[PDB]
Design a protein around this ligand. Structure first.
Ligand SMILES: [Mg+2]
Ligand SMILES: [Mg+2]
Lengths: 411, 227, 399, 226
């Protein structure tokens, strides 16, 4: 094929020996670098959302349907049949009250929680890996209670002992009924990031039998928004499935000024990624257009020799296709390698110390890479190949259009 | 009996500084199988004229008719059609593809016509031997000396047997050897093949080989050669 | 014209032939790239600085940030005078008796923390108080101020007094460590736009001391305002001369600290990507330009110009291009940074971040421009020397 | 003595074949002495004259100018030389494209930093000498084929060099500028003690230099026997 031969010869060096010109190799390297940086940035960005609703948002409840009239309003039959709407698929009930731990140690105040055994795993992500495996199977009878690294740490014992919290101030009504349920041992302990281990305690559901709470009707909970961001204020025109008495409590926006940080960070992320894309595209386009303009002289000779538009188009199409293909292959390989094996690159300059990028980051990840390939690398490769072909094509058409003798003399 | 046709072919270059006129109402004709020679002083406007004759510079207030059809008339595809089988243009300060050796450069009109591998090679070498630099068929223009590249350009022009051959000082960078020999070559071409020639040259000893040597006179081509 | 040959040649080359549209905007691609890189870097840095300032002030500013004390309490002279209390940052000294407490209420039992401030001195929360005499606040039988998120909503509301408990107290050992408790009176309700409301309350000075253990007149420690609470790790790692334990806000809002640390780290990674790509473009474009003009270099060398002068010829052009690019990029980046609040028609509906910008001209902006200058100078320096060594005849042959 | 060749040999070989050019070149150009070189295309005249200057490294020879070889000269020393003693003209003459004819002619002087006024006056001096004052405002692109050659000649002779090397100074021009420029060089030599060594193909006026040598694929034959 004539076009391929001419393109290859144009992409050849100025001197015998090396079969690669400086400009072609340079454009290849630029395209590869752009593709690699785009891949890395997109992978980190996607990992951001992958981790956000996995270790910092799942633990916090996504909503609440608490009302001032539980019986038959928020507690019709077993519960409000909020499962009808397809937004969520695990409602479960929810009972909350406060108490104190009595162990002859640093007393702490805990807002305890009620959780149903063989349940609460479809609801939130608080159930986490811990030595106390099969703990839920041991949760029953309203006797044993599970705490975090809170009052357990404050007290000088762990699961190895059986010290009871002895809630002394369980007063649902202001009058001091104070039913002191004592000898509630703990056999499992959980750990969470940072704080709020000080105010977590697991009580089997339907604990009202002995805690003097009224009946089996509790506050309840719902609205486990899977697409929390897209579900933001999505309860508008919805949520009537609950048929509660008073306006339900809000979604995770109730603990505001952290969701604000989340949204602001996401905005800055989008801005930075847009800047990356623009810079890389500009670099690639500038290099390709400069090279093609540098190769404008021979186009006039070909046109005056009788070359048609098709051959001129095909020559630079092949040139750009070759450059883009090789650069995209190299960039894809390097970027995939980096993204898949970036976090495992822990600098051993200081033995498990410092690294200048890891400090006080436990239960989170120093970096956050996630390679959602076969749907994102394809876009980058297609965009690179396009940009390359368009940059190759545009100046070639202009040079061919110009009177051949005119450009041979002027440029 | 007509190949070239000029009707007041005027031109002027002006980028916004001054009006630098070149030509004033050029008009002549080159008969089928007719030779002509152009003479004049530097700066007259010969090269610009011959560029206008082809479809390689837009005339200002004139037109050129080839085989009863103007040049701006031809579409881009039609002009590409024409340049392969009817144009034998040679370039002053001749420009060659630098990454292609002499053989490929000579063969390019045929490759563009897609003649044949074997025919193309044989005929490129045909014309190269005609010009007479067989021992530089493997040298790129960079490695070629000053004159052999000019002969390569001539061979490329005449490889495809064009009907008309426009030239810009085909033999001005060469000794008498290649000047005289290449005039012999063109002379046989015309009387063996019905090809016309129109060559601009400064060597007045052989300028009259074309006969009817015109004189470019800073606009209009004076019939005589009275300086 | 100009006596210096290098300057004239560089300026003329920079101007270019300008065939149709300034070389179809191909001649000034170097300046265009410098401008784009500088603009992007400036915008990113300004927005990150604004984010850090927002986190420092609008959230962590109101709440306590650091406390020092001794084992279970201080001594009669506050365990120390003001001397040897200032270590780093902008530290303001104010006695405090922070301690978690249970605010039992008739409507609903709730828990929260408090601050033992004195009426004499101001605090972040003094201007927010409404319908109350903060300045004239005597103990008044353990008077307190709190509300607008706890007393007003899910509480005993203003007036009618409220319960206050301190679990950390050993009053009567025989039973289950009965804490110290007493009824407190409400004389106001602070209105706050941060998390302070609903989790924090104000108490008179010395009332927490009387209620809690250790002698009256002492405190649980001293507030320490920090200039860089974002990077409070360095302060915590350092041990103050007195040996007092360093308490910090990270003990409560650890999730936010970890999240901001990770976000800053990965944003630095993105900035590194930006810098690498931009610098690659600078080197590539300027080097290819210098290599492109080798024929002119050869023509120039044969008529008296030394290898050491052509280097200046190219460095002049490089410096001029870098100057134009850096100035344009700085201007455009400053404008874009101080134009990000608006221009959010539909994205702003669900993403109300506003991209809080902070254009810190003094240092961050200038350093980027200087780095670009140096990079361009070196990139024009090396290829110029490489091309100045080739024999002119060899260069003019391949040309 | 101005030029001195001792078996000035050369050869180009990129790894394909040994393409010899010259075999033991040796001659001299006397101070204020004219010479002309004749031969067939491909003989190696341009390569020879490139070797004469410090613009191509000889393989197994040297060239001595004023009793000092060319490779002897340092880069600064060669730059020194090229401003006041070299009047080299280029085949397929190359000119700065972004600089008009006047500036191109004035460049040797600008590099010498003569004066604003002197430089302008003398650039125009030599331009009028060659006779293209009408195209003193045209860049090489706008200039035609011959006026650029005359601009190159003027640039070569603007600074009054001691020796003038040329590569077909008048081969792209009619008899007009050929004869007139030979007249110009002729006055230059006998008004000023400048020697000339010009390669040309026009044999009518090649003997103006007198002692016309004949480059013959290595060694310059003293006789013009073809
Ligand atoms: Mg011409
Ligand atoms: Mg030559």
């Amino acid at each position: 094929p004539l076009s391929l031969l001419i393109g290859l010869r144009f992409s050849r060096g100025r001197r015998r020996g090396g079969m690669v010109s400086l400009i072609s190799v340079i454009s290849t390297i630029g395209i590869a670098l752009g593709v690699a940086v785009l891949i890395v940035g997109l992978s980190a960005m996607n990992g951001f959302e992958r981790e956000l609703n996995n270790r910092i948002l799942a633990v916090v409840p996504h909503g609440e349907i608490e009302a001032v009239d539980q019986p038959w309003t928020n507690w019709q039959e077993a519960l409000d049949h909020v499962q009808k709407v397809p937004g969520i698929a695990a409602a479960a009930p929810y009972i909350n009250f406060t108490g104190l731990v009595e162990s002859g140690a640093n007393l702490r105040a805990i807002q305890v929680k009620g959780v149903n055994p063989q349940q609460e795993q479809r609801l939130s992500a608080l159930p986490s890996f811990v030595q106390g495996d099969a703990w839920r199977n041991f949760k029953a009878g309203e006797q044993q209670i599970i705490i975090g690294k809170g009052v357990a740490d404050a007290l000088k014992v762990k699961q190895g002992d059986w010290v009871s919290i002895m809630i002394p101030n369980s007063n649902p009504e202001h009058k001091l009924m104070q039913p002191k349920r004592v000898r509630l041992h703990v056999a499992g302990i959980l750990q969470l990031s940072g704080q709020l281990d000080h105010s977590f305690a697991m009580i089997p559901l339907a604990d009202a039998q002995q805690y003097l709470d009224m009946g089996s009707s509790v506050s309840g909970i719902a609205l486990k928004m899977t697409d929390v961001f897209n579900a933001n204020k999505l309860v508008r025109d919805a949520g009537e499935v609950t048929n509660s008495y008073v306006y339900i409590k809000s979604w995770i926006g109730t603990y505001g000024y952290m969701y604000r940080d989340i949204q602001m960070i996401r905005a800055i992320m989008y801005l930075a990624m847009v800047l990356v894309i623009g810079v890389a595209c500009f670099n690639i386009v500038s290099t390709l257009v400069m090279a093609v303009k540098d190769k404008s002289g021979d186009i006039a000779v070909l046109r005056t020799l009788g070359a048609k538009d098709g051959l001129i188009r095909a020559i630079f199409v092949w040139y750009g296709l070759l450059a883009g293909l090789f650069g995209s292959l190299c960039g894809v390989i390097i970027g995939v390698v980096v993204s898949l094996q970036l976090t495992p690159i822990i600098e051993w300059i200081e033995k498990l110390i410092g690294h200048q990028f890891l400090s006080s980051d436990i239960y989170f990840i120093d970096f956050l890479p996630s390679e959602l390939h076969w749907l994102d690398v394809f876009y980058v490769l297609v965009t690179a190949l396009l940009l390359s072909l368009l940059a190759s094509w545009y100046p070639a058409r202009r040079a061919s259009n110009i009177d051949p003798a005119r450009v041979l003399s002027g440029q | 009996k007509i190949l070239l046709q000029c009707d007041n072919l005027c031109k002027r270059y002006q980028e916004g500084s001054v009006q630098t006129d070149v030509l004033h109402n050029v008009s002549f004709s080159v008969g089928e199988g007719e030779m002509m020679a152009i003479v004049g002083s530097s700066g007259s406007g010969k090269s610009t004229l011959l560029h206008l004759l082809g479809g390689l510079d837009t005339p200002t207030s004139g037109d050129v008719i080839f085989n009863g059809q103007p040049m701006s008339k031809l579409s881009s595809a039609a002009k590409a059609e024409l340049r392969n089988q009817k144009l034998g243009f040679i370039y002053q300060f001749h420009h060659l593809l630098p990454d292609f050796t002499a053989l490929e450069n000579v063969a390019m009109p045929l490759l563009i016509g897609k003649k044949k591998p074997a025919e193309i090679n044989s005929r490129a070498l045909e014309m190269l031997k005609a010009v007479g630099l067989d021992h530089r068929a493997n040298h790129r223009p960079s490695e070629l000396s000053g004159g052999e590249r000019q002969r390569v350009a001539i061979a490329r022009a005449l490889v495809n047997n064009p009907r008309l051959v426009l030239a810009d000082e085909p033999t001005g960078n060469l000794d008498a050897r290649n000047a005289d020999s290449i005039f012999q070559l063109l002379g046989e071409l015309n009387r063996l093949q019905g090809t016309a020639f129109l060559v601009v040259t400064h060597d007045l000893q052989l300028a009259k080989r074309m006969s009817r040597q015109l004189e470019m006179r800073d606009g209009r081509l004076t019939a005589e050669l009275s300086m | 014209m100009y006596q210096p040959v290098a300057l004239f040649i560089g300026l003329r080359y920079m101007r270019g032939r300008a065939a149709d549209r300034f070389g179809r905007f191909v001649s000034w691609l170097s300046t265009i790239g410098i401008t784009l890189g500088v603009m992007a870097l400036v915008t990113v840095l300004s927005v990150m600085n604004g984010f850090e300032r927002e986190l420092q002030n609008n959230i962590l500013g109101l709440m306590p940030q650091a406390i020092l004390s001794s084992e279970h309490g201080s001594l009669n002279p506050q365990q120390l005078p003001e001397t040897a209390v200032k270590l780093d940052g902008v530290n303001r000294v104010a006695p405090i008796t922070t301690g978690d407490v249970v605010l039992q209420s008739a409507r609903s039992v709730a828990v929260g923390v408090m601050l033992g401030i004195d009426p004499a001195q101001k605090d972040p929360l003094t201007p927010y108080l409404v319908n109350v005499k903060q300045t004239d606040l005597e103990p008044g039988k353990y008077n307190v101020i709190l509300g607008e998120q706890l007393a007003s909503q899910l509480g005993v509301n203003r007036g009618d007094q409220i319960r206050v408990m301190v679990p950390s107290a050993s009053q009567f050992t025989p039973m289950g460590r009965i804490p110290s408790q007493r009824l407190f009176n409400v004389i106001g309700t602070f209105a706050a736009n941060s998390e302070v409301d609903g989790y924090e309350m104000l108490v008179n000075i010395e009332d927490a001391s009387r209620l809690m253990r250790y002698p009256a007149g002492n405190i649980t420690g001293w507030r320490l305002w920090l200039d860089e609470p974002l990077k409070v790790d360095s302060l915590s790692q350092q041990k103050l001369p007195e040996g007092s334990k360093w308490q910090d806000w990270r003990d409560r809002k650890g999730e936010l600290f970890q999240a901001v640390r990770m976000e800053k780290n990965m944003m630095g990674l993105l900035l590194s990507l930006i810098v690498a790509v931009a610098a690659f473009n600078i080197i590539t474009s300027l080097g290819l330009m210098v290599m492109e003009k080798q024929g002119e270099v050869a023509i120039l060398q044969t008529q008296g110009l030394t290898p050491r002068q052509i280097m200046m010829v190219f460095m002049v052009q490089g410096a001029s291009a870098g100057i134009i690019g850096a100035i344009l990029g700085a201007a455009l980046g400053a404008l874009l940074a101080s134009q990000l609040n608006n221009l959010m028609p539909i994205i702003g509906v669900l993403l109300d971040g506003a991209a809080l910008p902070v254009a810190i001209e003094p240092l961050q902006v200038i350093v980027i421009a200087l780095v670009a200058m140096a990079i361009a100078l070196l990139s024009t320096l090396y290829p110029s020397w490489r091309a100045a060594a080739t024999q002119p005849a060899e260069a003019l042959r391949y040309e």
